[PDB]
Design a protein around this nucleic acid. Sequence first.
DNA 1: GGTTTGGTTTGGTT
Lengths: 436, 436
Amino acid sequence: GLSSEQQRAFLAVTQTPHPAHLITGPAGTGKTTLLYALQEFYKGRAVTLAPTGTAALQARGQTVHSFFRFPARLLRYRHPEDIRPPGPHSPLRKAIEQMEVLILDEVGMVRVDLLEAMDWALRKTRKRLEEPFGGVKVLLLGDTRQLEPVVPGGEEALYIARTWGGPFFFQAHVWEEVALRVHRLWESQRQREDPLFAELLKRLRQGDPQALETLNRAAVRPDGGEEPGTLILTPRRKEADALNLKRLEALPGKPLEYQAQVKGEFAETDFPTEAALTLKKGAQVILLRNDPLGEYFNGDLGWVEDLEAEALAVRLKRNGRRVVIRPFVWEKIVYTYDSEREEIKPQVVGTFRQVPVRLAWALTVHKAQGLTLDKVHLELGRGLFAHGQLYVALTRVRRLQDLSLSRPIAPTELLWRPEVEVFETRIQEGIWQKSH
Amino acid sequence: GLSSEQQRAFLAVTQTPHPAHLITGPAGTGKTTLLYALQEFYKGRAVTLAPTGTAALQARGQTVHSFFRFPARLLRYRHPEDIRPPGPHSPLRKAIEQMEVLILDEVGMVRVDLLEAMDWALRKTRKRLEEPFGGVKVLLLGDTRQLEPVVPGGEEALYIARTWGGPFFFQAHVWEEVALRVHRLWESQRQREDPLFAELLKRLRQGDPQALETLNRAAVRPDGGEEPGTLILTPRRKEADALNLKRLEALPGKPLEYQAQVKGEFAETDFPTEAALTLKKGAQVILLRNDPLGEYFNGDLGWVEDLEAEALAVRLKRNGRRVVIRPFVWEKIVYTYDSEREEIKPQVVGTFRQVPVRLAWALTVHKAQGLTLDKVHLELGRGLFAHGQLYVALTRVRRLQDLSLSRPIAPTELLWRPEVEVFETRIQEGIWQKSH
DNA sequence: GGTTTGGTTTGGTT
Ligand SMILES: Nc1ncnc2c1ncn2[C@@H]1O[C@H](COP(=O)(O)OP(=O)(O)O)[C@@H](O)[C@H]1O
Ligand SMILES: Nc1ncnc2c1ncn2[C@@H]1O[C@H](COP(=O)(O)OP(=O)(O)O)[C@@H](O)[C@H]1O
Ligand code: ALF
Ligand code: ALF
Ligand SMILES: [K+]
Ligand SMILES: [Mg+2]
Ligand SMILES: [Mg+2]
């Protein structure tokens, strides 16, 4: 039951020889739902990828990293150590050579280096080094007014600025070779039954301070988090930890502590999960790693059923199956920048071994992007720090009734990237063409 | 090793249990050098703080603000919204509870609200409301004839006046509960090898008119700032900007401009650095914010190595390390007084986002307090405005030949605070105890 | 009619 604008985007995308399209629009316009119809249309022919585990599951695909086997680190431009082509008789080479279209959801969260590595990997594997993405038609979907890519500090941030001039997908050099045809969606599907709330979100997207003041007097209820069926969103992992502790201590089960093993240089701020992870039976959790056997993936929500030494059972929300979780290793990578040479080099400096589990009554705004949630409580904590973060938090629910805030938000807290503004204005013509 | 007067003050402070000491004396008597011996003596047990970034680095500690996590605004007396004890499991709580000695350098620049907030924060965290500083032994070092605390206009100035009677650290109500034992240093160490210049500085300290005339005859040389290896000191940031612009335009590198983003009420006189910051490779700079990763600090001097869109690399003077600088956000706080509540309230009215860098061939006198410099040129500009400003500028170097002035100084320019005079007189007795 | 003080957070894993 697609809408007039969705069916229009579908026809414009599926029924043209042009290899590079972008379907963009505000949160909840039905971009991912249009992606399902694209999956039904081509459907060996397509490969659906997303930047995050949560967005990957929402779109019924897998992460860009796990498909291409990219390392969890900076992907230097067309570097052979970072972008390694698959084996001569491997299933990955077979899928890449047989590929016809590639559907990339939540493209706003795809960092420039990741998009460039997808281009080069398809070119090297397909031996079509002259044409963008190896001749694969790319169907990109997302919203640059939602969360910007994650850029850590140090030499990695400097390399991105020097190579592309910024981290956004639209800053990739491939857009000099091919043009991006932009198809836009405007009608709110997620809040289609609350048109007043939809219009308030539309004004908040444009940074309207009157909208913000109205949001405050309508949604500020500090006790909204303690209500049933409510997911708490927070900017930082550490704040979700404190909120998840309260709900953990209220469970009647015996608790079991999972102690991590940390080696070399690994800072506690960098831990994917708690070093002393306490869990109880019945706890809401989210999984952080893909199962090597394929039973669970990064982003899978579920509930603890059994707690044992170095092993626990989780009942998945996605399919109601029972999966057993064992410890995984995480590498900490640091970038050195040799002085005599013009080059940057990665090096592993420490490891973290722990069960890939995190309590999931409270989650970061990053883990929520793409989801339609029944009820959300935003805990501001020490404040908003990423562009698009507040917008993502507020647009997850269908009705204004389903949303609550821990405290009022000031207009000075709203972040805006000028690169996004110039992009959003140039694509109003319908084409994104890069300069140089 | 220490001089005999430094050794007497070292023993006086370390062999008595008395919890509050002040080591004071003229510029360059070796207060901070004695502080180093105190760090060696105490030394898991001591935390070293200072009000400014440059003074913190010289003392090998950190700012008071960064340690206690105080906001960069007026700290209302024992106000819960301004003075927030750390969380139950925070590393800062562990540090405060384990702390035995707090060493506070450049205490003369510590504003009364800052000192009081330290006292209250220590009482609250350690849960000893009845002991000054929660039972921590405090060792203060500084000089009240050097720069007075910074007090911007408006309601913030009126609040300090009403609450404490003025801005100085010695006007803190904590001194009504514990006596401050005073230890004096007299021998110049910085100017040890130039005894006539040390004698001139001493007479300038006492406002001697004949000393000022002797200084004007020897030191006035307008072209002194162009001589190699010279740091220029100016009273105002905008005066330093103009002097920095001249030296920068002589570097051969290609310029790069960092454009600040300003939103809401901000005005240019409050900008921490230029809105249109021009940089070149090789430019001498000072960093204005602490790295969240800990590689660099507010006050760190260095030189530009790389210049990219939103990122630069600076080579630190302090350790020869290369650090990557990204934009930071600053807030503007105004205090509104409300009808018939005798209370003020803070509010964020604007933000300024910019790379935390300033050109550093010319610096403000405030940024020089605590340093020993090889060669100084004081550009008077529009004139002296703060108590102690001229004295700090003149006492940075070891020898008279190392100092030059842009123009002669008239006696009507010398500033004096009566609050300082009554304090300097009472501490001749060896004790300071606030009455009433 | 001026000067000082403050965190880089979040995602990807064969
Ligand atoms: N044409 C449609 N008719 C009815 N419901 C829709 C339609 N398109 C999307 N939805 C619903 O709206 C919600 C948000 O859609 P989604 O595709 O997740 O939006 P986006 O990807 O743009 O955020 C989902 O619950 C989805 O089922
Ligand atoms: N006892 C000493 N012997 C030799 N040099 C000293 C001694 N005390 C201080 N200095 C040097 O004299 C200069 C000023 O000392 P410093 O401790 O910074 O003074 P203050 O903190 O009193 O302004 C510094 O270069 C310091 O190394
Ligand atoms: F744009 Al969405 F969930 F995919 F708001
Ligand atoms: F008193 Al100083 F450098 F700390 F002159
Ligand atoms: K010790
Ligand atoms: Mg979606
Ligand atoms: Mg000193």
